Structure formats: structure tokens, C-alpha cells
Design a protein around this ligand. Structure first.
Ligand SMILES: CC(=O)N[C@H]1[C@@H](OC[C@H](N)C(=O)O)O[C@H](CO)[C@H](O)[C@@H]1O[C@@H]1O[C@H](CO)[C@H](O)[C@H](O)[C@H]1O
Ligand SMILES: CC(=O)N[C@H]1[C@@H](OC[C@H](N)C(=O)O)O[C@H](CO)[C@H](O)[C@@H]1O[C@@H]1O[C@H](CO)[C@H](O)[C@H](O)[C@H]1O
Ligand SMILES: CC(=O)N[C@H]1[C@@H](OC[C@H](N)C(=O)O)O[C@H](CO)[C@H](O)[C@@H]1O[C@@H]1O[C@H](CO)[C@H](O)[C@H](O)[C@H]1O
Lengths: 146, 146
């Protein structure tokens, strides 16, 4: 089931992990360019959605406010999670927000092209990344409205 | 996670529900054109996959062997599950095969355009159709190669 409270197209938000409390950031310099962060609110943590239509109905591009790059999540090559210019040129720019099975208020950030979800954890490196496999709570996110 | 044993493109199979043991038929006359069935094997139970690429990577159109029509699954009008000619002209012709979280030998037939899964049950009417909501065992299917 698609998450029922997806931000209206163009509305700004942070993506905050339910369990760690960390937010995603997307910037253009200093690797890692997309990662999790546990600190003050900065503009590189702000995103909006481009709504997919046609073959991308129920998919969304995740665009960085300060730099205009959209997120990607791929299993092909490093960096596995990153950003790129455009409005969703590549199939791995398109995400589905899939509501959790037990927690109605959180969702997984799923990528159809790569069959992966994003996760945020405090344990093994890489502590932020994507993953193809079983459902874990560290895969659960909130939309934080600004 | 995508089912790891999706039949090669052009390989013929039936779609059998795990628990009911019923198969999907797709015929060209007499509503319902697509429904569940038990009894001897007939040609209109036979399907192949059209493999999606680019935006449709990891999706598939389910094409009837004898009549060439592809399945569709929608929520906008009756019939909800049906067939249409072509090779996946419309977005609701495209399905994802999502492995069960518990049973790695079965999968759900998921429709991205409508956010539905196909189900086969002996209990309440309608006994076959599509569904948006919790994961139940009556939503699990097998590829039965012929
Ligand atoms: C100051 C600094 O270099 N911080 C980086 C650090 O974060 C570690 C903290 N203990 C934390 O709370 O996470 O490592 C991470 C990668 O895990 C980042 O690179 C941090 O760089 C700060 O990131 C924010 C993101 O909102 C901004 O880009 C800041 O400009 C950047 O310094
Ligand atoms: C596009 C390409 O040739 N490959 C990668 C390259 O980017 C080169 C462009 N000319 C450019 O962006 O300047 O390096 C970047 C670094 O982040 C990417 O990995 C490119 O990979 C392409 O990335 C997209 C991201 O959405 C997809 O993974 C594509 O499949 C991949 O080819
Ligand atoms: C379980 C394990 O060996 N750890 C990590 C591993 O292996 C996973 C499979 N080989 C796979 O499908 O990739 O490598 C990946 C790197 O992508 C993960 O870090 C695995 O850790 C698992 O990650 C999930 C993320 O949601 C959870 O943190 C699990 O607790 C963790 O075991």
C-alpha cells in the first residue's frame, strides 16, 4: 500500500528516519554527497517531490531544494545512493513510498529500478544506504513538513 | 524483493494460487473474461511475460498464449481485473512479482498503476479480484511452467 499522506507536489520537507531520528541530506560537494545526519537543520536536508505521471504513476522524484539535484538509489555502482541533475532522467530516480505493514505513520523509500529501500542505522557501516532484502524497522521514514 | 524465479520472456506458464490451487484464465468471450478456475488444463490458462525496460524495468505484462491479450488490474471501473489487446499499451497492464516476506516460493502479483494485488479465495464474493491493503496468504501465487 502506497503511503497515504505523501506531501503535495512542490511542498518542502525533511526525510527523517523513525528509529534513529536522522535526516537525509543531499549536497554537491564533500563525499558522501547523500547521507544521514544527526545535527542542526540545514537547507541541504530540504526536499520536494516531482510527481510521476504515465509509466511513473505512484512514483516520485526527490529533488534537493538548494541544489536542484534529484536522488538516486542503485545497486549497480558506488555511490549506491546519490544525486544527479535533472527532473528524473533515469529510471533509478523514481521512488515509491510504501506504507509499513504495522506502523501506519511511516513508510519505506522504495526504488523500482533497483528493487531497494533506503535505511538509517547506528550499527554497521555503511550506516546509511540502500538494501534489497527483508523488512527491518531501520527502513522506516517520516515526512517532516517545514 | 522481486521474486527471484520469474520465467524467461516467452516461456509459457499457468498462474496458480498457492492456497486455493486455482488458476487464472483469460478468455475473449463471456464475462468474467479473467477469473479463477479449477478443473482440467485449457489453453486460456496459459501466459507468457513481456519484459518491461527503462521506466518499466522490473514490471511485466502478462500475455495470453492463445489470444494475445494482456491482463490489467484497476480500481476505476468494472471489470477490475480484465484483459486488453496489445503488448502492454496502458500503465495498468504492468505487474511486479513481489516475493512473500515469509514464503520465498510464492509471490504477489502487484500492479503499480493501481496499487493492487491479485487474490484467489474460497470465502467471500468476489472470490477473485484485486486488493489494496494488508498482506494475506490468499494473495500468493506460483509460476507453473508447462
Ligand atoms: C561538521 C562535519 O563535518 N560534520 C559531518 C559529520 O557528521 C557527524 C556528526 N557527529 C553527525 O551528527 O552526524 O559526518 C557526516 C556524514 O555522516 C557529514 O558529512 C557531516 O557534514 C555536515 O552535514 C550537513 C548536512 O545537513 C551539512 O552539509 C554541513 O555543512 C556539513 O558540515
Ligand atoms: C551518466 C554516466 O555516464 N554515468 C555516471 C557519471 O555521470 C557522468 C555525467 N556526464 C555527469 O553526471 O556529469 O557519473 C555520475 C556520478 O554520480 C553517475 O554515477 C552516472 O551514472 C549514471 O547515474 C544515474 C543516476 O541516476 C544512473 O545510475 C545511470 O544508470 C548511470 O549511468
Ligand atoms: C545481514 C548482513 O550480512 N549484513 C548486511 C549485508 O548482507 C545483506 C545481503 N547480502 C544483501 O541483500 O545485500 O550487506 C548489506 C549492504 O547493503 C546490508 O548492510 C546488510 O545489513 C542488513 O541491512 C539492513 C538494512 O535495512 C538491516 O540493517 C539489517 O539489520 C542488516 O543485517
Amino acid at each position: 500500500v502506497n503511503f497515504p499522506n505523501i506531501p503535495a507536489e512542490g511542498v518542502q520537507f525533511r526525510l527523517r528516519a523513525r528509529d534513529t531520528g536522522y535526516v537525509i541530506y543531499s549536497r554537491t560537494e564533500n563525499p558522501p554527497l547523500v547521507w544521514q545526519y544527526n545535527g542542526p537543520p540545514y537547507d541541504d536536508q530540504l526536499f520536494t517531490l516531482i510527481y510521476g505521471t504515465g509509466p511513473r504513476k505512484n512514483l516520485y522524484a526527490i529533488k534537493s531544494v538548494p541544489n536542484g539535484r534529484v536522488l538516486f538509489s542503485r545497486t549497480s555502482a558506488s555511490p549506491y545512493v546519490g544525486n544527479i541533475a535533472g527532473d528524473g532522467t533515469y529510471n533509478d530516480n523514481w521512488f515509491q513510498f510504501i506504507q509499513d505493514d504495522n506502523d501506519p505513520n511511516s513508510f519505506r523509500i522504495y526504488n523500482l529500478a533497483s528493487d531497494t529501500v533506503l535505511y538509517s542505522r547506528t550499527t554497521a557501516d555503511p550506516k546509511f544506504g540502500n538494501f534489497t532484502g527483508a523488512k527491518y524497522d531501520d527502513q522506516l521514514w517520516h515526512f517532516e513538513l517545514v
